[PDB]
């Protein structure tokens, strides 16, 4: 039996990665390019919509629209759960990890209070796994999962310490069906990591929610994606595996019917899946 809906939201502060970013990695990499930062690249690049790592608005943008909230979206493509980014060359200019987004948020209050009504939305960890796999991380995946969880709990604790009261924390996505993971023959590694994060994180956050009296909602993205991928026709989806916009090994022309595609590129869902996700994320909240 469902429980009462949480109180309405008028302001969201979003922290996370390429699954939330609504223009920060674009703004930041253009600033880094203008300053000649070593190794800087224009992200996300030309085959993406208005600086989103997709062909449309991300889930949290749709969530804000659904809830009737203003959105401050601090998320940065590649952001890890700690201080830094998949893109290691960013660290010289800015710490764009979850921890760094939290630091920058709290630094820019100007000594005004945190908005205790504002929803602090956290959606991060995929970049931890991608960096570990692409650059041959030494740690066991179980340890990496442990670090991701501890990093996210530390971020919720630091935001709450500053006066945040309301949180929505997103689980690991299903990294196991990400085209790049399938192509890298890394499906079992993705399963192990995501199951370890998604088992531990809600237990760790439950404890923090109770100690601090937080309002903290957990969005199970894995259950969400399983339901889409089991019954795609229901949602008008046709292609669950092939990217609409291939980039690897090189850019090829976009598919004709992107709203019938799950994946935009080899890592990121299309605007259609982002819409369904943001609509599903809104389910715990009164409008």
Identity of the residue, 105 or 267, whose beta carbon is nearer to Br ion in the bound complex: 267
Segment 31-70, which members bind Br ion (CB under 5 A)? none
Comparing every residue's Cβ against Br ion, the nearest one is 82
- Of 2, 6, 53, residue with least CA distance to 217: 6
Q: Which stretch binds Br ion (CB under 5 A): 65-73, 88-96, 102-110, 114-122?
A: 114-122
**Site for Br ion (CB under 5 A): which residue of 9, 14, 17, 124?**
17
In angstroms, the CA 121 to CA 138 distance is: 30
Give the SS3 label for residue 120.
Answer: strand
Half-sphere exposure of 215 (CA within 13 A, CB side): 18
In angstroms, the CA 187 to CA 3 distance is: 35
Identity of the residue, 203 or 236, whose beta carbon is nearer to Br ion in the bound complex: 203
Give the SS3 label for residue 122.
Answer: strand
With binding defined as CB under 5 A, does residue 266 bind Br ion? yes
With binding defined as CB under 5 A, does residue 160 bind Br ion? no
**Site for Br ion (CB under 5 A): which residue of 91, 191, 247, 260?**
191
**Site for Br ion (CB under 5 A): which residue of 108, 211, 248, 257?**
248
Exposed, middle or buried: residue 13 (CB in 10 Å: 0-12, 13-18, 19+)? buried
Q: Which stretch binds Br ion (CB under 5 A): 79-87, 152-160, 236-244, 256-264?
A: 79-87
Is 59 within 8 Å of 124 (Cβ atoms)? no
With binding defined as CB under 5 A, does residue 183 bind Br ion? yes
Q: Write down the least CB distance from residue 236 to Br ion, Å.
A: 25
Nearest 10 degrees: Cα torsion 6, 12, 17, 19: 60
With binding defined as CB under 5 A, does residue 143 bind Br ion? yes
In angstroms, the CA 35 to CA 29 distance is: 10
With binding defined as CB under 5 A, does residue 147 bind Br ion? yes
Q: Which stretch binds Br ion (CB under 5 A): 5-13, 58-66, 226-234, 250-258?
A: 5-13
With binding defined as CB under 5 A, does residue 84 bind Br ion? yes
Give the Cβ contact number of residue 6 at 10 Å. 15
Identity of the residue, 153 or 272, whose beta carbon is nearer to Br ion in the bound complex: 153
Half-sphere exposure of 78 (CA within 13 A, CB side): 21
With binding defined as CB under 5 A, does residue 223 bind Br ion? no
| List of residues contacting Br ion (CB under 5 A) | 7, 17-18, 78, 80, 82-84, 97, 117, 126-127, 139, 143-144, 147, 176, 180, 183, 191, 200, 203, 248, 266
């Amino acid at each position: 039996h469902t429980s009462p809906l949480l109180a309405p939201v008028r302001q969201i502060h979003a922290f996370g990665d390429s699954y939330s970013d609504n223009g920060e990695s674009q703004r930041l990499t253009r600033e880094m390019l203008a300053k000649g930062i070593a190794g800087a690249q224009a992200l996300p690049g030309e085959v993406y919509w208005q600086g989103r790592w997709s062909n449309g608005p991300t889930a949290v943008e749709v969530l804000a629209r659904q809830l009737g909230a203003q959105l401050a979206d601090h998320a940065v493509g590649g952001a890890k759960s700690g201080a830094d980014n998949y893109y290691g060359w960013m660290s010289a200019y800015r710490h764009t990890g979850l921890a760094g987004q939290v630091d920058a948020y709290l630094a820019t209050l100007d000594g005004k209070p945190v908005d205790g009504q504002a929803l602090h939305f956290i959606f991060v960890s995929a970049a931890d796994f991608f960096e570990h796999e692409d650059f041959a991380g030494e740690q066991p995946l179980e340890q990496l999962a442990g670090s991701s969880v501890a990093n996210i709990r530390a971020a919720v604790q630091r935001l709450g310490e500053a006066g945040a009261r309301r949180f929505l924390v997103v689980s690991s996505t299903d990294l196991s069906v990400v085209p790049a993971v399938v192509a890298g023959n890394r499906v079992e590694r993705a399963q192990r990591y995501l199951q370890a994060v998604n088992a531990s994180l809600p237990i760790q956050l439950a404890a923090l929610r109770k100690t601090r009296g937080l309002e903290l909602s957990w969005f199970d993205h894995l259950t969400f994606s399983r339901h889409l991928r089991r019954n795609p026709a229901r949602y008008g989806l046709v292609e669950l595996d092939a990217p609409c916009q291939p980039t690897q090994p090189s850019v090829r022309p976009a598919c004709a019917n992107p709203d019938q595609y799950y994946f935009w590129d080899e890592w990121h869902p299309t605007r259609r899946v982002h819409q369904l996700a943001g609509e599903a994320m809104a389910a715990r909240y009164a409008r």
